[PDB]
Amino acid sequence: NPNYCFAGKTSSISDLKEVPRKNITLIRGLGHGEVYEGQVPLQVAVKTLPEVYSEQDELDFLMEALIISKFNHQNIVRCIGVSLQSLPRFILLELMAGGDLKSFLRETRPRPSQPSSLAMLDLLHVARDIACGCQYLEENHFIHRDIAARNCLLTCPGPGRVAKIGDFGMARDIYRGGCAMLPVKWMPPEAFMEGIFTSKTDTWSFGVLLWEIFSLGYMPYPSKSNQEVLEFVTSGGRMDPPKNCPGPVYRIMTQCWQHQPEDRPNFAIILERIEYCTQDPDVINTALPIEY
């Protein structure tokens, strides 16, 4: 069975915490593989491997469990354990009741009915949370490869929410696919041209995540196809600021999108800049757009 090394330790499937299947109860679907809300009473999200999947899918599923299980950080979803000795195979994750970040942003947009549903500080706190997760990954020499709103989760809908990175499927595939499935809209030039990935890959992607956050859940590069983005970005093209986006926040995005990786900030610097934004009244007092 496949092994996995993180920090200074190597791990195997035997190291995963097996939870007896009889202790696990599915409660409801959460938005499907398929994902359920479950109980172990400990509340969990249950990631399932469809029995109709192949052997490579099995190994990938397993590797993802190993990956998440070896992290220890507040802004990365916890793995409660697995149930691998019964079918279908389960991975048990920390239940994040706020759901994925993209859906949250789109559904929580300030409206005439909910004008104060979200403010700039809430968005900055989400960004800080994920940047803190990214900093942990960077300092432990782990490259995520698909930092994007769809891959982040929230502990809860309301004000005390904490954002975490919740999916590691792309780092898993590369660890051991199609062109039209590559997240090119989140990738820097050296990644989609040369297949070169470093921590500065994730910096670029984080810039795109920031745009997603401050646009309140829009698809990056509106109206552009993947190939059009590839050509646009290679030629020096960059997204405009999201509506009402404060200059200091947009500045972090454009720094994340520097053409040369050496010119992009590491996550320690990104965190410092996000923190300064949270201190600036002119940033956090900026009203978000209210769609009618």
Ligand SMILES: C[C@H]1Oc2cc(cnc2N)-c2c(nn(C)c2C#N)CN(C)C(=O)c2ccc(F)cc21
């Ligand atoms: C593997 C899965 O994990 C969780 C999903 C949810 C909560 N907690 C965890 N751990 C969740 C979702 N929506 N809702 C309403 C809930 C709830 N409650 C999102 N979802 C359906 C996903 O598949 C998904 C999306 C992105 C990501 F990073 C991980 C996951």
